[PDB]
Design a protein around this ligand. Structure first.
Ligand SMILES: NC(=O)C1=CN([C@@H]2O[C@H](COP(=O)(O)OP(=O)(O)OC[C@H]3O[C@@H](n4cnc5c(N)ncnc54)[C@H](OP(=O)(O)O)[C@@H]3O)[C@@H](O)[C@H]2O)C=CC1
Ligand SMILES: NC(=O)C1=CN([C@@H]2O[C@H](COP(=O)(O)OP(=O)(O)OC[C@H]3O[C@@H](n4cnc5c(N)ncnc54)[C@H](OP(=O)(O)O)[C@@H]3O)[C@@H](O)[C@H]2O)C=CC1
Ligand code: NA
Lengths: 175, 174
């Protein structure tokens, strides 16, 4: 029970890249993870009432397996045609600060999850709307790729914990 | 024991060490606990030799703000940069060539690869790093010198909070 929080929760290489240069997540997919442990997906997703993601993140979701989530989803895109029948969603284009009160209203008192990518998260951080960042670092470097949070920003560390092959850490907005 | 080679460095949470203005500003007013988990004091006592790039050696001499009594090797093509105040052996070339000498001078303690990311990557590429230990500061930089600029795979040992920092240690697969 809190005011609705907006949280950016993502996996990353230990050196700060999500997606590699070849546009894939193979470095992520066969790692040990414990979805019911510390910062695990099972406890996290129960707190969440709505998803928001960019166009590439949405395309990745509709093109790999069939990740099923119960919450409504918003996609930041100039391309409505991306919509797949397997993943219905609401398109929004423009300033995320205008979208944010609708996400909070659509979340049913639960939290807003910023799925990615780093450019979408930075938009929310530049509008001052991210309350928490949760990064699960995989035990590899990539050197190059999409950056986890491509800007200058300051946070307060809450804590970190190992979860399988991952280092999971949560930071909070300074007050 | 077996002499290990360890890359131990601070980084922003998003993977940059030196910022775009060539400074370590965002690092210096942060709470850390030297004798805590992965803290500097417990680390340094396991170290018998240091090795670092030219730019790191220059900042250390110019900020003159840090002490050490292990012997130090500096990877530089400008052996002119040496300061009497911070003694060191110059080496240039393939670090795989230098690494037997570091290990023999380590007196059975470990070799600390200080930085930068480029120097760490040359060791990793020659399969010479046994452990990476990164202390992540609670900030992002977006750009700057990369913590480890190459593709590599590791096994996670563990992480722990130390003051403002997330510290984590990964090991070479064996
Ligand atoms: N680790 C994970 O959970 C997963 C990661 N991947 C994702 O693949 C992504 C690719 O990276 P990145 O490029 O950062 O991708 P994003 O998913 O953030 O997509 C960015 C694109 O979204 C559109 N967009 C972003 N902001 C707005 C806006 N305010 N208004 C309208 N359109 C906007 C633009 O596309 P356009 O103009 O063409 O519409 C832009 O190119 C990774 O970042 C990662 O998140 C994939 C699956 C899972
Ligand atoms: N650990 C930390 O958090 C600290 C970091 N620093 C900072 O780090 C920064 C330096 O980082 P970075 O720029 O990555 O540089 P490095 O310290 O790794 O130095 C890179 C330079 O060292 C030389 N070099 C590298 N490899 C070799 C080789 N095998 N043989 C011969 N010469 C070699 C080259 O210089 P050349 O050919 O000219 O000799 C190269 O340009 C400094 O700007 C400093 O501010 C400072 C204090 C603490
Ligand atoms: Na609505």
């Amino acid at each position: 029970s809190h005011m609705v929080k907006t949280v950016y929760y993502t996996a990353s290489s230990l050196d700060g890249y999500i997606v590699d240069e070849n546009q894939s997540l193979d470095w992520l997919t066969s790692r040990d993870i414990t979805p019911d442990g510390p910062f695990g997906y099972e406890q996290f997703i129960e707190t969440i009432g709505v998803l928001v993601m960019g166009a590439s993140t949405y395309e990745w979701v509709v093109e790999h397996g069939d990740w099923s989530y119960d919450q409504p989803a918003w996609v930041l895109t100039h391309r409505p045609e991306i919509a797949a029948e397997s993943h219905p969603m609401q398109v929004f284009s423009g300033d995320v600060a205008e979208l944010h009160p609708e996400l909070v209203a659509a979340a049913g008192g639960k939290d807003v999850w910023v799925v990615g990518g780093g450019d979408v998260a930075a938009q929310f951080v530049a509008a001052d709307l991210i309350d928490e960042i949760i990064v699960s670092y995989a035990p590899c470097t990539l050197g190059v790729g999409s950056r986890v949070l491509p800007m200058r920003s300051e946070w307060v560390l809450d804590d970190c914990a190992r979860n399988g092959d991952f280092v999971c850490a949560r930071w909070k907005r300074p007050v």
